[PDB]
Design a protein around this ligand. Structure first.
Ligand SMILES: Nc1ncnc2c1ncn2[C@@H]1O[C@H](COP(=O)(O)OP(=O)(O)O)[C@@H](O)[C@H]1O
Ligand SMILES: Nc1ncnc2c1ncn2[C@@H]1O[C@H](COP(=O)(O)OP(=O)(O)O)[C@@H](O)[C@H]1O
Ligand SMILES: [Cl-]
Ligand SMILES: [Cl-]
Ligand SMILES: [Cl-]
Ligand SMILES: [Mg+2]
Ligand SMILES: [Mg+2]
Ligand SMILES: [Sb+3]
Ligand SMILES: [Sb+3]
Ligand SMILES: [Sb+3]
Length: 548
């Protein structure tokens, strides 16, 4: 693998939940240790499962890994880091300022943005500890900071700037107050990340048109900041051999192939490697090492069943939630089509420009134009009296992932009024953290009401995807919102295929589909992987399955 050659001391893997960052990190680490290298593998995930892959316990202390001489490990709990980042800011004012005021400050330090900044404070310490490079040849991270987090830290206004105590509170700048270290150490960490002789960044992706576009954008954001030592690793690729004697497998192999040849322009110049889809989720060293090779029914109702029950009261707000790319826009469209086809009045709203298109009206809003309106608004409102460096800090705050989630939700709110006379289906929504923040100043009670509103969480039958969905649900629950049901999309165990490998992946999904049914959701739906893309009504009608 090109990405495995002549690696510098720091190696970072980035990419969406579940693409294989940790798996690839572990396998890499083993490979390196076996070439006689001293390796430090830093586990950075919220519910670290790395100890498990090496059959041993790991902690916030560097411990050598028994089964792999040369390799040591370190767990940096992000939830815990955020919790402590939060405590350092709030404890001083507990019993000083009034409870509702402190409680409000605490909520500002409870979003993904704070977690991200806290993580960076942890990376920073590692990236600045010179002695570590005295003990290790390589330090590997299974996540990477985002362009937004890095830009925030490189802004002069982040140090010399007091933004009128976020009143309306559209702000996530609260976290900055918690920066433990000296401006200089973060600056250094950033140079270390931008230095190709020190840091190598691995973009992990899947051979799916959508993901590839997201990775492309990630690549541009990071290169623009100075991280130009980048490698792309396409994981989970279906080996052609398998396209033999199977409509599904041959069709998937076919779609990946197209995409492999029509990689988005911005990624074509990057060193690209591909890792083949393995039959069993890697649990040990043998399994992990196999990943770098160069050569190769659950009892859950159909989506129709969920629409069936949603239909029961003739109207309401149906909100689809979940991480990016899990299928919210697709599910939202399917649900809207079924309702419509059964004589109901449906108004489907979307933040994505793409839908074929009668008692089914579609409103598509443009995320970019809504974001800019919202940004304009928050600028004339909070930006006055701020010097230029302060305004740029605020503009970067308005580049947080939630900025867009708030502005689109804002717009969707025009039609959220129709959920009283008909069905309104939305394909996205803000986090519980954001809702609480917005409510501080927005139809909160409406969202909270079990009748008027049913929130659906979309996820995949995979470990990380389910955990991220559970976390998205926990957060919503804090905002007084209980997801009405979960939809497990892209399932193979509910699809028709004789591909031995595919049947093996489908069996791998069993435990995941099980934990959703008994530990996370009350009402659950299974949707098969359709092969090809569900671009039109026909296909969109196939995802649902049938009645009774
Ligand atoms: N090429 C592959 N083929 C089959 N399984 C894989 C592959 N890559 C990862 N996985 C399996 O997928 C899950 C996805 O996870 P992980 O690698 O933890 O990714 P991330 O760190 O990006 O969430 C695990 O259950 C894992 O062992
Ligand atoms: N069950 C499925 N079978 C095949 N492709 C699917 C399925 N669900 C989603 N996809 C495909 O996946 C992408 C995942 O996307 P999308 O539904 O846009 O979601 P989100 O709004 O969650 O980002 C699109 O390329 C899409 O058409
Ligand atoms: Cl946030
Ligand atoms: Cl936050
Ligand atoms: Cl942030
Ligand atoms: Mg991981
Ligand atoms: Mg979408
Ligand atoms: Sb945010
Ligand atoms: Sb926030
Ligand atoms: Sb932010």
């Amino acid at each position: 693998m090109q990405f495995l050659q002549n690696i510098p001391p720091y190696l970072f893997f980035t990419g969406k939940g579940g693409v294989g960052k940790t798996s690839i990190s572990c396998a890499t680490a083993i490979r390196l240790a076996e070439q006689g290298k001293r390796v430090l593998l830093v586990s950075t995930d919220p519910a670290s499962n790395v100890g498990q892959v090496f059959s041993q316990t790991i902690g916030n202390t560097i411990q050598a890994i028994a089964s792999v001489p040369g390799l040591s490990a370190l767990e940096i709990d992000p939830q815990a880091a955020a919790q402590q980042y939060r405590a350092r800011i709030v404890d001083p004012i507990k019993g000083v300022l009034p409870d509702d005021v402190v409680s409000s400050i605490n909520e500002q330090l409870s979003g993904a943005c704070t977690t991200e900044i806290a993580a960076f404070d942890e990376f920073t310490g590692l990236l600045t500890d010179a002695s570590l490079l005295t003990r290790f040849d390589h330090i590997i991270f299974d996540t990477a900071p985002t362009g937004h987090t890095i830009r925030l830290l490189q802004l002069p206004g982040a140090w010399s700037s007091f933004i009128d105590s976020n009143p309306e509170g559209a702000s996530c700048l609260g976290p900055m107050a918690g920066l433990e270290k000296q401006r200089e150490q973060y600056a250094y960490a950033v140079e270390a990340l931008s230095d190709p002789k020190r840091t190598r960044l691995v973009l992990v992706a899947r051979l799916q048109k959508s993901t590839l576009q997201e990775v492309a954008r990630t690549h541009l954001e990071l290169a623009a900041i100075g991280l130009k030592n980048q490698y792309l690793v396409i994981n989970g690729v279906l080996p052609k051999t398998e396209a033999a004697n199977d409509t599904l497998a041959a069709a998937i192999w076919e779609r990946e192939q197209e995409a492999l040849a029509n990689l988005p322009a911005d990624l074509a110049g990057l060193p690209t490697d591909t890792l083949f889809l393995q039959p069993v989720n890697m649990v040990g060293v043998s399994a992990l090492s196999r990943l770098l090779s160069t050569q190769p029914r659950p009892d859950i109702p159909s989506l129709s069943a969920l629409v069936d029950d949603i239909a029961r009261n003739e109207h309401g707000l149906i909100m689809l939630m979940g991480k990016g790319g899990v299928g919210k826009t697709t599910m939202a469209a399917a649900i809207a089509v079924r309702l419509a086809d059964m004589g109901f009045d449906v108004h489907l709203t979307t933040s994505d420009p793409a839908a074929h298109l009668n008692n089914l009206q579609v409103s598509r809003i443009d995320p970019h134009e809504e974001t800019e309106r919202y940004r304009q608004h928050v600028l004339e409102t909070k930006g006055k009296e701020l010097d230029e460096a302060g305004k740029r800090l605020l503009e970067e705050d308005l580049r947080s992932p939630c900025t867009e989630e708030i502005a689109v939700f804002q717009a969707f709110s025009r039609v959220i009024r129709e959920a009283g006379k008909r069905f309104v289906v939305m394909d996205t929504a803000p986090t519980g953290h954001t809702l609480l923040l917005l409510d501080a100043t927005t139809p909160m009670m409406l969202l909270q009401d079990p009748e008027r509103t049913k929130v659906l969480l979309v996820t995949l039958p995979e470990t990380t995807p389910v955990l991220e969905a559970a976390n998205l649900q926990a957060d919503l629950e804090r905002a007084g919102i209980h997801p009405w049901g979960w939809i497990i999309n892209n399932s193979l165990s509910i699809a028709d295929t004789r591909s031995p490998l595919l049947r093996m992946r489908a069996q791998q999904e069993l435990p995941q589909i099980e934990s959703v049914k008994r530990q996370h959701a009350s009402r659950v739906a299974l949707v098969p992987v359709l092969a090809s893309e569900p671009t039109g009504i026909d296909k969109l009608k196939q995802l649902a399955g049938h009645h009774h």
